[PDB]
């Protein structure tokens, strides 16, 4: 388990991904690569992660993505893609498998726009884990519930378990990583007046490859306290 | 040319696309839209256009976008889609022609990369038109410069005359419409120290597709002075 701390400033640039494999630049706790690697696991790719220190970051990393930050796709041919959407999308289309994606133009274009009303969450949770007292908290709770009505209202339209169907695909692994930090951040009250995304959730940790990837709130607590303090050990919770 | 008044507050809802066509609702001198209505024209797609009084919406036009932005496109089944990059994508994968995106997954997530690294130019020049003297006149002038260094770079790793190749794609239709605005908004210096992408506005400018949709600066200029005053008349603005 050791061989998965992460690498930092001063750490040596790494060697060749192997032919077969793709890596991942990616960080345990990171609910940006977490899509990247849902994806990964749902495809059955084979892969190597390395995880990086984000508070102390090698100078190496910023020539795999010039903004430096996780995830980034590496392949045996040396190609580089970041983003996470991106590299999530590359995935689905380079390798064999279940498709995440429609083929069909229309419901994939759907599945984006559900992803472009899920847009704002990103940011909130950040301001989230910011928040100081309960009046931010109440402030809070009401933003978060002004978007997860929005994520209601399609899942009431289609009546499907899923955004994009009765079967899990691209947009529910894009969305899930700050469902999941939900709980832990106790935000948990905010799916109250959504009955179909509470049922949503439900269903999302019993995917398999969620349950495989899934942190628990402890672990996730542990990397929020040390991640609050600017921590170079943060990354590496737990190792 | 008055048929391509807008359409505002009072207006009735439009009836159904005809079959074989699609419908594109707009603004004139909106740039997000203008990537939509690039692709139409390089893909040579059959359409209609619904101007829409952005200061004056149609109650109806809610239920073409939640949202309440252009473009939406409609098609003859009654879908619709919205956001800029969705409803050019989508155009790319329904319909025939030119491709405009990469089939292979590396250079398509190549392009995607790109438009992230464009990605903070069009709030820019939402600030620019706010810009008040020539002190933030300065220091937004360095803050462009950054963000095209940025493009820049890909350019001369690439030395091809177009930001995905030695043809014109989606990429470049893409970010088109932000600089065909620097002009007009005095940012025309702001290319100095990037002569690859100053190139690269004079190739695209010889672009038939860009050519045949280039507003003048006259009428650009037109609109925005009645867009910072909120006037109802601006989307309408020569007709
Ligand atoms: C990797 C990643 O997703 N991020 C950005 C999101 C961080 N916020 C959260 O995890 C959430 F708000 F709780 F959801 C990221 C970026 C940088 C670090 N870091 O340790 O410097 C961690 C995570
Ligand atoms: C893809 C999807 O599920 N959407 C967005 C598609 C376009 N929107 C519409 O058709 C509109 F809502 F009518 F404008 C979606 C989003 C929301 C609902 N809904 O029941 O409110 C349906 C479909
Ligand atoms: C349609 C469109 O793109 N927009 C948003 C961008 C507006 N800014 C500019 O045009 C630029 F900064 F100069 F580039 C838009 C949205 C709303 C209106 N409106 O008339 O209310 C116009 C344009
Ligand atoms: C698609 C593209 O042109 N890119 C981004 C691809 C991945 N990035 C790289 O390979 C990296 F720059 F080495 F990290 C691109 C962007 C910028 C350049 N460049 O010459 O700085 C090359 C390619």
């Known amino acids: 388990g050791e061989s998965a701390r992460s690498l930092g400033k001063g750490s040596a640039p ?5 032919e077969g494999s793709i890596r991942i630049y990616s960080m345990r706790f990171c609910p940006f690569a977490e899509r990247t690697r849902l994806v990964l696991k749902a495809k059955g790719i084979r892969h190597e992660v390395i995880n990086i220190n984000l508070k102390n970051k090698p100078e190496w990393f ?3 993505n010039p903004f430096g930050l ?4 590496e392949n045996s041919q040396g190609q580089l893609i970041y983003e996470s ?3 999530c999308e590359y995935l689905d289309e380079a390798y064999p498998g279940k498709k995440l994606l429609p083929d069909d133009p229309y419901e994939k274009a759907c599945q984006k726009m559900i992803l472009e009303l899920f847009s704002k969450v990103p940011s909130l949770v950040g301001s989230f884990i910011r928040s100081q ?20 209202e399609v899942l009431t339209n289609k009546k499907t378990t899923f955004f994009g169907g009765n079967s899990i695909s691209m947009i529910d692994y894009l969305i899930w990583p700050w469902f999941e930090r939900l709980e832990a951040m106790k935000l948990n009250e905010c799916v109250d007046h959504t009955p179909k995304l509470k049922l949503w959730m439900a269903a999302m940790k019993e995917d398999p490859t969620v349950s495989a990837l899934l942190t628990s709130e402890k672990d996730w607590q542990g990397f929020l306290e040390l991640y609050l303090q600017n921590s170079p050990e943060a990354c590496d919770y737990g190792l």
């Open 85 to 87: 959407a991106i590299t």
């Open 70 to 73: 996780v995830p980034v796709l």
């Open 133 to 152: 007292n309960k009046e931010d908290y109440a402030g809070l709770k009401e933003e978060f519930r002004k978007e997860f009505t929005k994520l209601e």
């Open 14 to 18: 790494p060697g060749p991904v192997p």
């Open 62 to 64: 910023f020539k795999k």
